[PDB]
Paper text:
The microtubule-based motor kinesin-8B is required for development of the flagellated Plasmodium male gamete, and its absence completely blocks parasite transmission. To understand the molecular basis of kinesin-8B’s essential role, we characterised the in vitro properties of kinesin-8B motor domains from P. berghei and P. falciparum. Both motors drive ATP-dependent microtubule gliding, but also catalyse ATP-dependent microtubule depolymerisation. All the reconstructions show that Pbkinesin-8B-MD and Pfkinesin-8B-MD contact a single tubulin dimer in the MT lattice, with motor binding centred on the intradimer tubulin dimer interface. The interaction between Plasmodium kinesin-8Bs and α- and β-tubulin is centred on helix-α4.
Intriguingly however, P. berghei kinesin-8B exhibits a non-canonical structural response to ATP analogue binding such that neck linker docking is not induced. Surprisingly, the structure of MT-bound Pbkinesin-8B-MD in the presence of AMPPNP is overall similar to that of the NN state. While density corresponding to bound nucleotide is clearly present, the overall open configuration of the NBS is very similar to that in the motor’s NN conformation. Consistent with this, helix-α6 again abuts the C-terminal end of helix-α4 and no neck linker docking is observed. Because this variation in density is not attributable to resolution differences, we conclude that it reflects small structural adjustments of the motor domain to the bound nucleotide, but these are not converted into larger conformational changes. As a result, overlay of the NN and AMPPNP models of Pbkinesin-8B-MD (aligned on helix-α4) shows only minor structural variations around the NBS, β1-lobe and in helix-α6. In both Plasmodium kinesin-8Bs NN reconstructions, there is an additional connection between α-tubulin and loop 2, which protrudes from the β1-lobe of the motor domain and appears to adopt a partially helical configuration. In the Pbkinesin-8B-MD-AMPPNP reconstruction, the density corresponding to loop 2 is less distinct due to the above described motor domain flexibility, although at more inclusive density thresholds, connectivity with the MT surface is also visible. The minimal structural response of Pbkinesin-8B-MD is surprising given the neck linker dependence of MT gliding activity by this motor and its relatively conserved neck linker sequence.
Residue numbers in the entry:
A (entry chain K): 2 to 39, 55 to 134, 136 to 201, 212 to 250, 258 to 342
B (entry chain H): 1 to 44, 47 to 360, 369 to 436
The structure:
Amino acid sequence: ITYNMNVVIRCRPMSNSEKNEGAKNVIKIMDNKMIVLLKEKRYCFDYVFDENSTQEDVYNNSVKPLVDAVIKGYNSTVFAYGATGAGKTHTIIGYKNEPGIMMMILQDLFKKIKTLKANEYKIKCSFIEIYNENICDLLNPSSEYLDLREDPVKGITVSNIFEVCTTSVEEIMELIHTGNRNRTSRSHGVLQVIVEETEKGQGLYQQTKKGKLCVIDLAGSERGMRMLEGANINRSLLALGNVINALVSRSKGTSKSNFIPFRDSKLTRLLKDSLGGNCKTLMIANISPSHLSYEDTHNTLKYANRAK
Amino acid sequence: MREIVHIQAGQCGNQIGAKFWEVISDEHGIDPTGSYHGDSDLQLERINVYYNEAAGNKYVPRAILVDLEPGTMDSVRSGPFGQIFRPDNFVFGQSGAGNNWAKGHYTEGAELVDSVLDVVRKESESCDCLQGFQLTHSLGGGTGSGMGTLLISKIREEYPDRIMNTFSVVPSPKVSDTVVEPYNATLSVHQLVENTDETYCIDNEALYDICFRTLKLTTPTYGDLNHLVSATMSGVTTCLRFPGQLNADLRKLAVNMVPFPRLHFFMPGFAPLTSRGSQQYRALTVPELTQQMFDAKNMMAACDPRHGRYLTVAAVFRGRMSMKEVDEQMLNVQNKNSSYFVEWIPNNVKTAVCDIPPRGLKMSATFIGNSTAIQELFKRISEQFTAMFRRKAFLHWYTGEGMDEMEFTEAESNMNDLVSEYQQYQ
Ligand SMILES: Nc1nc2c(ncn2[C@@H]2O[C@H](COP(=O)(O)CP(=O)(O)OP(=O)(O)O)[C@@H](O)[C@H]2O)c(=O)[nH]1
Ligand SMILES: Nc1nc2c(ncn2[C@@H]2O[C@H](COP(=O)(O)OP(=O)(O)OP(=O)(O)O)[C@@H](O)[C@H]2O)c(=O)[nH]1
Ligand SMILES: Nc1ncnc2c1ncn2[C@@H]1O[C@H](COP(=O)(O)OP(=O)(O)NP(=O)(O)O)[C@@H](O)[C@H]1O
Ligand SMILES: [Mg+2]
Ligand SMILES: [Mg+2]
Ligand SMILES: [Mg+2]
């Protein structure tokens, strides 16, 4: 019933610009599970990362269990979350010479795959851009934008999407960075892979498993082209986020027994398969320590308490 | 300022559009030639909302007429007000769609559509501040359902920030005119869900009931039925065309009546409606109008409002009226009929008043309700689709036009989801 959505907070370091403004530390960490926003409104989570937390620490204390669930045959999804300027792309993709959990994930995922492979794997990587509700194929951009299609037993496939059956960390890493070069953030960077495993004994009944691992560079809350992008982006951010609130009611097991509004957006409808599936989920809120961001840190965290 | 673009697609749609145009020209003092012969300066002040001004003191509807068959066009051109339309705005095919949504959406209507698109782009370029589009058609046939769907998809692609309004002729339960109606409706409804901002669900059965029971009319013709629809259409946009005391246009109405994106299917209504005999034995007053409008038997959709709850209702009043009286009456209806209104949206009623009444009447009213009872319409349709689809009945024709079974599966799923969502918010 529940989606087991753990909620962690990552505080990005104060920038030189914030220091030059003279902004002080609006975020005060009280515990690994609790922060206050300065006065001192409380927010409570499963884990909080401070300004010096590394990419490896984020992996180890927040998503490693999700990646593991996938290699073990489950679905899992990481939703980085917040207002524009929050810290999501850096946490997820980062830079090729300073990568995000995408790389930390590939390194751990593939060590586990190579070991387990002794069950043949097909690591079906895909990467899409959800922009104005259209889906860009970022691995094969010649197909431009795609739609979403329900399937026999109504999960969802991005129509005619290009997938790559990779074997290594570097293959997916380069594939993804290229995919980011093909992007517009004005869109939701939905990165996903099907960790498919078939009994090396192919002549035996192939009772395969299809684990699903997904991490999203959600377009942030924004306060004519850009106005529309903002509009569409913010609307989808409210739609997926309140589909999360519906999931909380479901997970709680309260009297609000209804159909969760995943159909409100293409973003959510696709995410549906993992949001309500046999899965583990994680939201990584991304916030700033600066007084300058208080509005942002205040709204991003308010949501995070509700999601949690 | 604030120009509306009118589109008519398929036979029924075209017919309704003709009626609409006739009424509106009369209202604005425009004759069958396009010349203004009215008295009031108020009739011309906002003439540009629906009419383009041509050379030599003439006015022409910002209307596009679409059909896969040419006969309908001819019929329109030969009918009353036929000559007012711009000849270049008639876009017709030669083949027809044969009650096949696939022919209208994928094949014939696809070949047709580019011309239509070109026309409508030009029409958009002409107007300075186009507020949006109004499409009149039916979801039970081929040409009317497919062509309209494709066109609305294209207009949401090129005009994603503009208001998209449809006036549809929903298939009734008992009076089933065709055999594949369930299929065509299902396919079109799905598309409407994603691409229209507001959809006025009009039903022939309900119209008949109105005509028979309320007007006491010996022999209704389609024209008579169409008249009612036309009146309703006129009502919604009265605020764009005239002054008033409280003014609400298409956008304002949508924002007040649509609390969740998908829930944009209205049950419209009109009042007053009396016979010739019962005209003398009545009070021309706001309380009476209010009484009429909220009655279940005055709804133009075949759904019982007493089977659900009103999420929101917009009332649009025309004529010289006291605001206080209007407010009292609307508060009274919500207090007395508490059980028919969702309790978690306080003041479920939005009011708008235009000083200029329709011709012949001193006071008039138009009703727009977002009722959870609309689920009944969807549910029946879904059921019928299931009944057909389980045995793959008539599927072959659709597949011969390039359509795949999976689309049907998708649409049905979508509709089911929609139904569920309505139920839960009840
Ligand atoms: N309320 C009205 N309903 C109508 C009218 N004419 C037809 N209809 C209804 O609409 C349905 C028939 O639709 P159409 O003739 O519009 C189908 P269309 O010409 O659009 O496509 P084809 O399949 O190519 O004929 C059916 O339910 C009729 O009973 C009308 O003047 N008023
Ligand atoms: N006292 C008084 N109140 C009015 C009058 N007209 C409208 N209202 C009130 O004003 C509110 C509605 O706001 P409006 O002023 O009509 O809306 P607006 O400022 O034009 O804003 P938009 O139309 O939404 O752009 C309601 O509370 C009405 O009761 C008036 O003549 N006198
Ligand atoms: N933990 C971090 N350490 C160092 N730099 C960071 C960190 N987090 C974010 N940044 C930087 O801040 C800029 C990134 O904003 P990110 O790209 O983090 O914003 P975003 O959340 O993707 N914004 P948006 O796309 O609008 O929702 C990047 O160039 C990062 O290098
Ligand atoms: Mg980003
Ligand atoms: Mg026809
Ligand atoms: Mg106003």
